[PDB]
Amino acid sequence: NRVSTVQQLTKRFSLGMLQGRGPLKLFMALVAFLRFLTIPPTAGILKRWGTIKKSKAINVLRGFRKEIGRMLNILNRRRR
Amino acid sequence: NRVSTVQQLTKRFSLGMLQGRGPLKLFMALVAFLRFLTIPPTAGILKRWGTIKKSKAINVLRGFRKEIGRMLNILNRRRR
């Protein structure tokens, strides 16, 4: 269908993001995962890509960068 | 169970990774996603955390950093 996959974040973001929300990563994290294995952005991913806030998405992607650096702090203390 | 979730990458990494594989992100991407929403690393995630290669995982996490920067190149060209 290339469009019935973004429905999940379309029903979860009913009232929140544009208002404030908290994490707002659930959407980026999901599409990013698929974007890391096959990059199959359904229709909603693109149509919603240019109709959200960006300030929160870009900040979220920035937090993901800090979250990945933290993962290294986890795989860098194994000692052996 | 806190252990029957890593089984998926345990059956997919049967013969590869230590040999060469290709992406080897499927594992980090999955645990990373959960690590971005609730950080529920099952038993395997930890026991396997200190018994893999790290050079490939760290390189994978580095590729994820380049993949996220690319996502911005996508959410920075919307114009409006």
From Swiss-Prot, chains A, B:
Region (Hydrophobic): 17-52
Residues in the Cytoplasmic compartment per record: 1-80
Localisation: Virion; Host nucleus; Host cytoplasm; Host cytoplasm, Host perinuclear region
Function: Plays a role in virus budding by binding to the cell membrane and gathering the viral RNA into a nucleocapsid that forms the core of a mature virus particle. During virus entry, may induce genome penetration into the host cytoplasm after hemifusion induced by the surface proteins. Can migrate to the cell nucleus where it modulates host functions. Overcomes the anti-viral effects of host EXOC1 by sequestering and degrading the latter through the proteasome degradation pathway.
Subunit structure: Homodimer. Interacts (via N-terminus) with host EXOC1 (via C-terminus); this interaction results in EXOC1 degradation through the proteasome degradation pathway.
Protein name (record): Capsid protein C
Protein species of origin: Dengue virus type 2 (strain Puerto Rico/PR159-S1/1969) (DENV-2)
Shown residues within the full chain: 21 to 100 of 3388
